[PDB]
Structure 1
Amino acid sequence: ASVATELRCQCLQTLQGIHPKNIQSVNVKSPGPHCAQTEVIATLKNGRKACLNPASPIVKKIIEKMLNSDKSN
């Protein structure tokens, strides 16, 4: 399907963060044999995506927020 020494830092770059309303999904790829630096990702609600920095406070909150986004309903 897709696997062959082809793993690049899914988030070569990163953004300080963004409102949790502009995001839609949250892909957090931990560091491994391809990237020793965590890589957070947010799929905007417009089919767009934006990597964030897990070292910043706004990013750590971007995730903690999505988590609640799914609290019963």
Structure 2
Amino acid sequence: SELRCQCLKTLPRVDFKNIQSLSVTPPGPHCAQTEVIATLKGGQKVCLDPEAPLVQKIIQKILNKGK
């Protein structure tokens, strides 16, 4: 068996409020790149650019969102 990178394209942002969850996968046997996949509240799955400052900012706003 062989898996590969599942992102064809990476996007520069999504709206914070629309994120249901994100998965962040570092490089490994499957893929040389970190992949960040946002699942949005309508079911969409989107690949985000993990190096984009807005994407890192969104991630941070999520990590910090808890009360």
Structure whose alpha-carbon radius of gyration is higher? 1
1:12-62 deviation line (CA, Å, top 9, x unaligned)? 321011121121101111111221111111111111111100111011112
Moved over 6 A (4+): none
Q: C-alpha separation between the residues in 2 aligned to 1:35 and 1:12? A: 12
1:31 aligns with 2:48: no
**Corresponding letter in the other structure for 1:65:** K
Q: Give the structure-2-normalised TM-score.
A: 0.84
Q: Which 5+ residue runs of structure 1 have no aligned equivalent?
A: none
The one of 56, 59, 63 equivalent to 2:55 is: 59
Structural RMSD (CA): 1.4
Q: Which 5+ residue runs of structure 2 have no aligned equivalent?
A: none
